[PDB]
Amino acid sequence: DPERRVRSTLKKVFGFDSFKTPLQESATMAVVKGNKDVFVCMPTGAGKSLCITIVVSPLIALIQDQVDHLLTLKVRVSSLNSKLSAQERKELLADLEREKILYITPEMAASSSFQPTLNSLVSRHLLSYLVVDEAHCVSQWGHDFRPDRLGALRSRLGHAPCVALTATATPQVQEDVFAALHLKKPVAIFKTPCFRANLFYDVQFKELISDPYGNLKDFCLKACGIVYCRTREACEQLAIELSCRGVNAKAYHAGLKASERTLVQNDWMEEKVPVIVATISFGMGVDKANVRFVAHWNIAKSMAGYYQESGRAGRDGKPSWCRLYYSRNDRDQVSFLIRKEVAKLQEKRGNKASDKATIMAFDALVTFCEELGCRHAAIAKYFGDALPACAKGCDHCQNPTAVRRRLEALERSSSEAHKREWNLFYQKQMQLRKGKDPKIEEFVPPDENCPLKEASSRRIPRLTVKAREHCLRLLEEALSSNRQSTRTADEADLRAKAVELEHETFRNAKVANLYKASVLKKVADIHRASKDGQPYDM
Amino acid sequence: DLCKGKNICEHGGCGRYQPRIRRSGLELYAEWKHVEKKILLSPERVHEIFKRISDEECFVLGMEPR
Amino acid sequence: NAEKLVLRIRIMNSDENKMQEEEEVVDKMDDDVFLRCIESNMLTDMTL
DNA sequence: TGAAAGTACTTGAGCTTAGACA
Ligand SMILES: Nc1ncnc2c1ncn2[C@@H]1O[C@H](COP(=O)(O)OP(=O)(O)NP(=O)(O)O)[C@@H](O)[C@H]1O
To answer: CA A351 from chain center: how many Å?
Structure first.
């Protein structure tokens, strides 16, 4: 079997024999394209390249790391990015446009710097695999500078089979991966279990801790490590705090600098700074074999992000704890954040129920943090796995009693300055009342013959066209009652009279209930004039 | 006001840290957080600390050295 | 034009016509006492 | 059995993120 070349490459070119897991071996023999698309979930290993091929890695750090690693592994691999040298880019474009692994970022994949090159490599059929690297939900996430490919790459690249690579494969996430990437059915599922016994998963509540700084300092003392503070310069704050408490910690707010991080990262690689704090960053740097803790000071966004950032610990298998510091205030703040994000998102794009997929992802995180049971069991349930049968190494596994008491205490822990306080309280307590999928607009246009000037107007929110028609009919009945009390001309002019009255009320109104109140106020005036026996003038 | 926010000493050497000084009656406490914890700051220690302040560094502090 | 300048206010949110409610959040703030807070805030800081 | 007020201190909080181009 070419498996002979696989063995030779592993022995000499790779430095292995693919024996860490037989599952990845079966995946490698699956990528020989005896099947209709293979869905492998990169876990504690890789086997691509063998299984010119374009590498779709969204972040250039992985592009560099991998191409230099393969070059040191005696492999001729090329990379294409904008930050690359102009002369190097020109010579690479020259030697690729005419006569074995290409690493590119999607920014120029659909741009003029590579699209003619893409067509040249497609028409000449020089491509054998269109593989997207760390194809995590990365696909279905972010600025989305890539369809995913739909037929704009999966098909635009008729050949180049196309293989997927995501750390987290939950049922909905993986089926949406297939739907977006247009992976041809039946996609060969090669999914590794997410259970890991080397991580002591636990959750500590900041409110219950008298001094969270001291508790987290004690945690990192009993252990490299990457604590995760959300954002808002709180990363720098926490780094200084720990440095004050005796933990040499640095920061990685995206608002720093490639320079700032360039060293900030390598310092950490060689244990110059044992602890490094990142906001949501550090999608790379995952080769340390130590990572003794990835405790999250702030809650993550979903099981996808949490699991991806937390599995980086214990690469060699040694225990690495990893915690999550939870705050109800943080929970509702991030809930506000995502809700306003999707509210502005619908204002610029379509329905895209993935917007709500995000909100129940966050709710799944919240309920996992606030549930009672094995954390490994919860992550397996979210990822579709089975019972982990994990021994001590959980909050519930090690001591069920203490966690229950802590949760019970947390339940009882609920209870011009007040203006912001009341505003926050009201908004957070009624925002949650709206529930999931808060899009619900479905603006109905005027059907065929609405007697409504500027009927297609969105000035008054939640004012249906049918409601305005109902108010117009009520005004029409009022005018007809006035007609059979004062003997006006006819109904043909009364129709326009009612239309004009409704339009005047609409212009004078700003919100729906006020508009209805004004409509009802006119109706009485009319009836009153009919009782006054006088015609209802202007 | 400017210096009460600088918890670290860099400029110059001495990259070590700064404790919080808290007054309880007649005693000053060098309250190191964890870098024992509440070491009593004896007046001998503060006298030794003050003795090494340069004339320029006390002039900027506002107190004329002479 | 009545006998009691009466005003009625509700707290309409429902759920935009979705499926019931499963595992509601702990701090739901039941509408009765949420209406308590709403009425108190209106009676105290409305600045009409 | 019932000041009153002005000033100098602390202490906590705390607020989006993502890579490319730029
Ligand atoms: N069969 C194997 N035998 C030996 N070493 C292997 C094997 N498979 C993978 N490895 C090594 O394990 C490393 C980790 O791969 P992988 O877990 O995909 O990377 P990661 O960035 O640490 N985690 P991930 O999020 O899944 O990408 C690879 O780079 C290989 O060096």
So the answer is: 16
Rounded distance between C-alpha atoms, residue A289 and residue A312, angstroms: 9
β-pair type (A249-250, A275-276)? parallel
| H or E element that contains A9 | none
Distance (Å, whole) CA C48 – CA C46: 6
Q: Which nucleotides of D are covered by protein (CB under 7 A)?
A: 10, 14-22
> How many beta carbons lie within 10 A of that of residue A458, not counting itself?
8
The sheet carrying B38-41 orders its strands as B20-24, B27-31, B38-41
Residue A434 at interface with chain C, using a CB cutoff of 8 Å: yes
HEC-encoded secondary structure of A293-340: ECCECCCCCCHHHHHHHHCCCCCCCCCCCCEEEECHHHHHHHHHHHHH
Q: Residue A433's closest CA among C19, C15, C38?
A: C15
Q: Using CB atoms, pick whichever of A419, A429, A438 lies closest to residue C29.
A: A429
For ligand 1, whether the C-beta of A284 sits within 6 Å is no
d(CA A155, CA A116): 16
Q: How many CB atoms are located within 10 Å of the residue A394 CB?
A: 23
H/E run at residue C40:
helix C31-45
A350 backbone dihedrals φ, ψ, rounded to 5°: -80, -165
Q: Cβ distance A377 to A184 under 8 Å?
A: no
C-alpha Rg value of chain A to the nearest Å:
31
Interatomic CA distance for residues A310 and A365, integer angstroms: 14
User: 3-class DSSP state for residue A137?
Assistant: coil
Strand order in the sheet with A38-40: A164-165, A38-40, A188-190
* CA of residue B42 relative to chain centroid, distance: 12
E strands, A373-412, are: none
CA-CA distance, A15 to A334, in Å (whole number)? 44
Chain A residues in contact with chain B using a Cβ-Cβ cutoff of 8 Å: 214, 217, 240, 243-246
State the resolution, in angstroms. 3.2
- 3-state SS class at B59: helix
Q: How far apart are CA A313 and CA A290, in angstroms?
A: 7
Cα A120 from chain centroid? 35
Answer yes or no: do A432 and C28 touch at CB < 8 A.
yes
DSSP A433: G
Q: Compute the radius of gyration of chain C from its Cα atoms.
A: 15
Binding site annotation covers B9? yes
Quote the tokens at residue A326: 């939870």
DSSP labels, A177-222: HHHHHTPPSSPEEE------TT--BEEEETTT-S-HHHHHHHHHHT
> Closest nucleotide (CA of A59 to C1')?
D19
Nearest nt to A106, CA vs C1'? D20
- Quote the tokens at residue A227: 């604590």
Alpha helices in A98-170 (DSSP H): 106-109, 115-123
Provide the 3-class DSSP secondary structure of residue A75: coil
> Which residues fall within 8 angstroms of residue A39, CB to CB, at 6 or more apart?
A164, A169, A174, A177, A178, A183, A187, A188, A189, A190, A191
Q: Tokens 């020259």 belong to which residue?
A: A94
Which H or E run contains A153?
Answer: none
| Structure tokens, A433 | 């009342």
Test the A interface: residue of C6, C29, C43 with most A CBs within 10 Å:
C29
